[PDB]
């Protein structure tokens, strides 16, 4: 539909596998949990804890 651009560069074969990487909350905020074991998509999680 409009202009493109080939991009020819080096492509050596290289290992690839995910690992755990967890997000955190900057100083001054907090992360709220839903410790309920029945969490339908939305709705009040009747037990919340901070982490």
């Amino acid at each position, epitope marked *: 539909n409009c202009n493109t651009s*080939a991009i*020819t*560069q*080096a*492509c050596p074969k290289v290992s690839f596998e995910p690992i755990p990487i967890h997000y955190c909350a900057p100083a001054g905020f907090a992360i709220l949990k839903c410790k309920d074991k029945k969490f339908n998509g939305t709705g009040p999680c009747p037990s919340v804890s901070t982490v």
Partner: antibody
Amino acid sequence: EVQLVESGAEVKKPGSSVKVSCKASGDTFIRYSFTWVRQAPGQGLEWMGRIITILDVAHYAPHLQGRVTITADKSTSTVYLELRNLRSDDTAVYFCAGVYEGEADEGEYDNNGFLKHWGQGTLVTVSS
Amino acid sequence: DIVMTQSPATLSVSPGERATLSCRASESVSSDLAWYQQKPGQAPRLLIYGASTRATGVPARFSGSGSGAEFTLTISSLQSEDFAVYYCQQYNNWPPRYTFGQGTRLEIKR
């Protein structure tokens, strides 16, 4: 299984533009990669470059880039080439080669580098 | 480029002897070479690809292979229909800006 037919010779001084056609017909055009190479009689050979048609992307030669155009028309599934800014010493026989590639429409594409088939012959008398 | 020190440069040869062309390289060239042939006043015709085995769908008397740069095209029995040139070509480099060669020019007994 697609055919390769080529063309003849033209007289122009260095600088002109000429259209040449390895008009390829006969069967499925998609499964094949296409490339060009020329040689003047008694000297080395000038390889043009490949055009990966299913993406419709080509390449060229380092010390020829700037005055060449190779096109692979998937719609008509033909081939065209437009040459410009020629030089007199380059009166050479031409050839169009190709290789069976694989199920591009299914994604498999080996992308090898040899030249399976060979063209017929095409001359560019860069002179008057 | 791949230093096609084609040995011998040109060979005026007869039918029926072990062909050994040496067009070696200067840089690491693993498994990519190519040999073709062209008859005087005729079209070129492929001989060997794969750089490790004979070409496919071809009359496979030839065995064009060897050790890295020292790759020999092997037709042990030359014939009356091989008075034609022989080539060396490489297709390695990436980013893709490929290369070519000049080959060798075989001739009849002169």
